[PDB]
Amino acid sequence: MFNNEPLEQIDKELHDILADEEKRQRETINLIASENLTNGAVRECLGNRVSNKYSEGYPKKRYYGGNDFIDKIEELCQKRALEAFNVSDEEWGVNVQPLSGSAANVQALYALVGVKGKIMGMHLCSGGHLTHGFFDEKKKVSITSDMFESKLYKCNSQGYVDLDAVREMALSFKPKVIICGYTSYPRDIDYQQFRQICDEVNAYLFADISHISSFVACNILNNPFLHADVVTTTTHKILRGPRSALIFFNKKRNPGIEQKINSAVFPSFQGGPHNNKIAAVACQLKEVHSPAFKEYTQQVLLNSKALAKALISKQIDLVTNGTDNHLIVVDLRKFSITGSKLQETCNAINVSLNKNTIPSDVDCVSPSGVRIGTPAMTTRGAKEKDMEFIADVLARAIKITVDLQEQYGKKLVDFKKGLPGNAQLQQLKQEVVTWAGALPFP
Amino acid sequence: MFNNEPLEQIDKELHDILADEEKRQRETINLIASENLTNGAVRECLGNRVSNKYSEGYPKKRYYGGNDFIDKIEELCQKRALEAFNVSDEEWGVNVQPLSGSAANVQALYALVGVKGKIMGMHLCSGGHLTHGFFDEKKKVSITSDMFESKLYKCNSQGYVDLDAVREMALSFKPKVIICGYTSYPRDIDYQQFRQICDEVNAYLFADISHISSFVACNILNNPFLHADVVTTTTHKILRGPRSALIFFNKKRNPGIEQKINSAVFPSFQGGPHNNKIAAVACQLKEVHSPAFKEYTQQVLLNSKALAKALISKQIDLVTNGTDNHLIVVDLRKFSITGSKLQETCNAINVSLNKNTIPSDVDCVSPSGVRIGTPAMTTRGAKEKDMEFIADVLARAIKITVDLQEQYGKKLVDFKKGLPGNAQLQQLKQEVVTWAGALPFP
Numbered sequence A, B: 001m002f003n004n005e006p007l008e009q010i011d012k013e014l015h016d017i018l019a020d021e022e023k024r025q026r027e028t029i030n031l032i033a034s035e036n037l038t039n040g041a042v043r044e045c046l047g048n049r050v051s052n053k054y055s056e057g058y059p060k061k062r063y064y065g066g067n068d069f070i071d072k073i074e075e076l077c078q079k080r081a082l083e084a085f086n087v088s089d090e091e092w093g094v095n096v097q098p099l100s101g102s103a104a105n106v107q108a109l110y111a112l113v114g115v116k117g118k119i120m121g122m123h124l125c126s127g128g129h130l131t132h133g134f135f136d137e138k139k140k141v142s143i144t145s146d147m148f149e150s151k152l153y154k155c156n157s158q159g160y161v162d163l164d165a166v167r168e169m170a171l172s173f174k175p176k177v178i179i180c181g182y183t184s185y186p187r188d189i190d191y192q193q194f195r196q197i198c199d200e201v202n203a204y205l206f207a208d209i210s211h212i213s214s215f216v217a218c219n220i221l222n223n224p225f226l227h228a229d230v231v232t233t234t235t236h237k238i239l240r241g242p243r244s245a246l247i248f249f250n251k252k253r254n255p256g257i258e259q260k261i262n263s264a265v266f267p268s269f270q271g272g273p274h275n276n277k278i279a280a281v282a283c284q285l286k287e288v289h290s291p292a293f294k295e296y297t298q299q300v301l302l303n304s305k306a307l308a309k310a311l312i313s314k315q316i317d318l319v320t321n322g323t324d325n326h327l328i329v330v331d332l333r334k335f336s337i338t339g340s341k342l343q344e345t346c347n348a349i350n351v352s353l354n355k356n357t358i359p360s361d362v363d364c365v366s367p368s369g370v371r372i373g374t375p376a377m378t379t380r381g382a383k384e385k386d387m388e389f390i391a392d393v394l395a396r397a398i399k400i401t402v403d404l405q406e407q408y409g410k411k412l413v414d415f416k417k418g419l420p421g422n423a424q425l426q427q428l429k430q431e432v433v434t435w436a437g438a439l440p441f442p
């Protein structure tokens, strides 16, 4: 007593928009550091009938009948996750049920410190995530500044983590958790140094490696698993999985952490797991452990380096003057434009990026930079030689933005009046489209 | 630089388990009150490339480029949602970003009362959800008992909500929110009466209609939208959508509630929306508003009434002695067996149900009932006449359970040694498979 005609038939209205979306993705230079493109197999898992099953709890201990094959999927995903990050199931545990990065983080922090517990994270404007305790004088923007007592460490004026500031703050504030691993941080992290500050104050070491996970799995960047108590990561960014998350926990350093984290995910926060996600994660984690995926990840850093190098060669300034990873933050102060303007300009030419703060940004109403990254385009086969074009396209967009602002003014509503039908923008779009639309698309 | 082989080729291990899961779903009598089967259209949305897009924020106010077609999908889903529940966009608003029911509830409660705020919900044992403030003597089991101050009202010894007890509790405790609408409650709710109790003590009325949503839309059961300040619902149960949730809020009764709820969902709790979910939710919400779907939902209640009636005709006791909705709770005290034993027995014959408390239960270690429901089997085409067969199968399972406990003992670990290779169970399983396997399966 259901309707089984295809999407296109049942809902032509929705099917048009999705078809539109697919054309825009195919025809965009996607430079969002946190985006990627999933393969057909990951998307086959996400559409699988396994999302019909309620399976609250954990393997073998399910509050519903008929969970025998769901248990195998969930245990396979845990296995592959410990394999991907080169950890022993004797020493490390992983919860695979968290619905996304933000949920995973609030859950993991709750497990460690409880309500009113103290945490330390990097400030938003310095590259930290919302879920690392972010707040404003005006309000407690994240739940992690409200359900917990949070304190925020800033980076220095060059953009680097200042460990002397982290230690000083940890000694006076005495948090139970210090969060490192970030959202728009272009350098690697001295986890050992964090571990040393946490041992000093008897605080847990939380590493959120969502943005850099693939590097950690492939041994290209530092490994927080040598030093960290908890490691969270989303699966949808550089790792190239579905939208989901993983909480890793060190049983050897913290006996009984396993039950606290598992009880935090369920029944404290979540109800039913999303088994289509877990399937999809299982599938991508198998790809992650092959040497082919390591080649992809290597290519991501090779593209990021080149893209950084080409922008500097066109007199564009970068936070920390470079990158150790997949992402760059461009400082736009020398052109007297905002990242909010460059994002609209770039949207008009099919270039996807985001506005981003820089260390000198006092207020998020006008961020002075944009963040870009290479995972997505590296998935489409762009090589090092291809990065000069992207750098040229971004250079041209900055210049057009400067022209548009001169003509129409620094007010954002006014600036947008300048964009539609602009002949250079139409010309740049056409160039962007022709190159992007040519690339392999999963 | 990706692998585009199909799922079967890239990951044969995982593909087999999923083919196994599909076979088990096809050949199971699924009586889980919270489960259903999605059509191929909803599953096409869930596997769509729209899940590649980061779109943190709300339509038009997005922190990333390239969100033009995502904004249309997200505004289409909100529109279709308000249409489905027969509310005007001038008086009612809806957030469509919550990842699941538990998230929706914690977010909505936070919006209304904040950390340390006071809430009242129905106790777990009496049919309430975990997210309605559930705790026990030993621990704050749900975050809704810890981040909030919760108190729990019980149903009477017959299983019905005791409004007198809710009034008494509200006057002494003075909560800021009262939650009604439940997980294992077999009757309809007098929301007006709740609205009257909330106006007395200036509390918000929260209706969680996850289990009865299709009835509320189709106008078969009482409508909490006439009375409630907030309505939450999952989209994966009787409504038959993907795994997601909706928060509805009453703008007329509560000017400014829109911002509170939207900011609670993001950036307080969540990060990026899962756009494949929102597409999927959009698709099914269109079906929900059709006359075909009302027919389905009427059939759910016609099946549930008949199933109640046939079980009573075989001397099986039901909590409240019947049902006004899609679900029944069988009291197993007269047979001296537990619901945990009947769940295993039923799992051995491909009958999916869950163990469930009844009002006399003092421990969730030994629940005295099972909950069953008709949405799933109703989706497979089962009519009123077919409920006698389901009732026959359940009666036989209870009888076999009694026999096995007699032979092997009351101990749960001992009882399971009875189940494998049991000739009658093999006979019953075979009978279950034959009827289930033949039905229409989306």
Ligand SMILES: Cc1[nH]nc2c1[C@](c1cc(-c3cccc(CC(=O)O)c3)cc(C(F)(F)F)c1)(C(C)C)C(C#N)=C(N)O2
Residues within 6 Å of the ligand: A123, A124, A125, A126, A127, A128, A129, A130, A136, A141, A183, A184, A354, A355, A356, A357, A364, A365, A366, A367, B056, B063, B267
């Ligand atoms: C949207 C989002 N989520 N997590 C983030 C962001 C980022 C972000 C968040 C915000 C943000 C989001 C919600 C609330 C607030 C507070 C406020 O509006 O004052 C800021 C703002 C910006 C920008 F550039 F507009 F200033 C950026 C970006 C990755 C998009 C961010 C930065 N910078 C960091 N560090 O992390």
Ligand SMILES: Cc1[nH]nc2c1[C@](c1cc(-c3cccc(CC(=O)O)c3)cc(C(F)(F)F)c1)(C(C)C)C(C#N)=C(N)O2
Residues within 6 Å of the ligand: A056, A063, A267, B123, B124, B125, B126, B127, B128, B129, B130, B136, B141, B183, B184, B354, B355, B356, B357, B363, B364, B365, B367
């Ligand atoms: C799994 C789950 N989520 N929300 C529920 C449940 C239900 C449930 C939760 C629980 C439950 C879940 C987690 C933690 C606890 C506390 C404890 O184990 O002591 C109980 C137990 C049962 C049962 F029957 F085993 F006793 C049932 C069922 C729908 C499965 C439930 C009941 N009864 C109610 N009212 O609501």
Ligand SMILES: Cc1ncc(COP(=O)(O)O)c(CNCC(=O)O)c1O
Residues within 6 Å of the ligand: A033, A034, A100, A101, A102, A103, A105, A129, A131, A181, A182, A183, A184, A208, A209, A210, A211, A234, A244, B054, B270, B271, B272
């Ligand atoms: C370090 C980090 N942790 C957690 C999250 C949360 O992920 P969800 O969106 O799945 O909640 C993000 C999101 N990253 C935002 C961005 O870089 O675009 C992140 O960058």
Ligand SMILES: Cc1ncc(COP(=O)(O)O)c(CNCC(=O)O)c1O
Residues within 6 Å of the ligand: A054, A270, A271, A272, B033, B034, B100, B101, B102, B103, B105, B129, B131, B181, B182, B183, B184, B208, B209, B210, B211, B234
């Ligand atoms: C009334 C109610 N509200 C919210 C939720 C939470 O939904 P998620 O599982 O999607 O978090 C449930 C789950 N229902 C459990 C059951 O009846 O089987 C529920 O029954």
Ligand SMILES: [Cl-]
Residues within 6 Å of the ligand: A046, A274, A276, A277, B046, B274, B276, B277
């Ligand atoms: Cl999903």
